[PDB]
Design a protein around this ligand. Structure first.
Ligand SMILES: [Ca+2]
Length: 237
């Protein structure tokens, strides 16, 4: 193995994520899941903390609406195979939906789900002690991705500290791990005769959604603002 790319998120508090690596996606159209947040390019929703982390902040505004950030490496960093990992301290709260994931690099020239989607880590706030790893592709998408979950080995909340979420990825096979512990592997044999769409470059995405069909919506147990802290993203080949 060799570390071929990383963002270690060095820099003073309030600095922008490095534009050599990152794009901001913006908007409040639901993002395919009836999500509530408006993603912005404001330093109030994504910036470095001066302590070596990227911080994405989900906020509630005076009118009751929500803002957050969704950062991608589209057209800038496009891994194909190896180990793709991030050290992340996830937020917490009912309705909060942090994610580290990848979309096939031909999107939207190729539509979703044909483009492929690899979800490295997703969490929903009502399950603080669980993360999910998933694949979306033709015939296995949306409500029915190839998927599974990993519970914190002691049953504790993942939001308590930083954890390393990764996939190890090769032609025809993807393995998910948390803190180095592999918990599932899906291969071309698991698609039930549907095409395996993961033998191509992907780009990376970090976001915090607020609300959605799967997580449900914020309630009295949700405390805004909420931060996702990312110490680094590293790609090994
Ligand atoms: Ca760092």
């Amino acid at each position: 193995a060799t570390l071929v790319w990383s963002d270690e998120f060095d820099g003073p508090a309030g600095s922008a994520p490095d534009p050599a690596n990152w794009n901001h996606e913006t908007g409040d159209h639901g993002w395919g899941n009836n999500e509530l947040q408006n993603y912005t390019d404001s330093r109030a929703n994504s910036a470095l903390d001066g302590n070596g982390n990227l911080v994405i902040t989900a906020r509630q505004e005076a009118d009751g609406g929500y803002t957050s950030a969704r950062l991608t490496t589209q057209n800038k960093v496009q891994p194909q195979y190896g180990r793709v990992e991030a050290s992340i301290q996830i937020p917490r709260g009912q309705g909060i939906w942090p994610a580290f994931w990848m979309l096939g690099a031909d999107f939207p020239n190729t539509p979703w789900p044909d483009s492929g989607e690899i979800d490295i880590m997703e969490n929903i706030g009502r399950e603080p002690h669980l993360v999910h790893g998933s694949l979306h592709g033709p015939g296995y998408f949306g409500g029915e991705p190839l998927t599974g979950s990993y519970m914190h080995p002691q049953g504790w909340s993942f939001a308590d500290t930083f954890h390393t979420f990764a996939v190890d990825w090769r032609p025809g096979s993807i393995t998910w791990s948390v803190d180095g512990v592999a918990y599932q592997t899906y291969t071309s044999a698991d698609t039930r005769g549907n095409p395996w769409v993961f033998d191509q470059p992907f780009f990376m995405i970090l976001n915090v959604a607020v609300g959605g069909d799967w997580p449900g919506y914020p309630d009295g147990s949700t405390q805004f603002p909420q931060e996702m802290r990312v110490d680094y993203v590293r790609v090994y080949e």
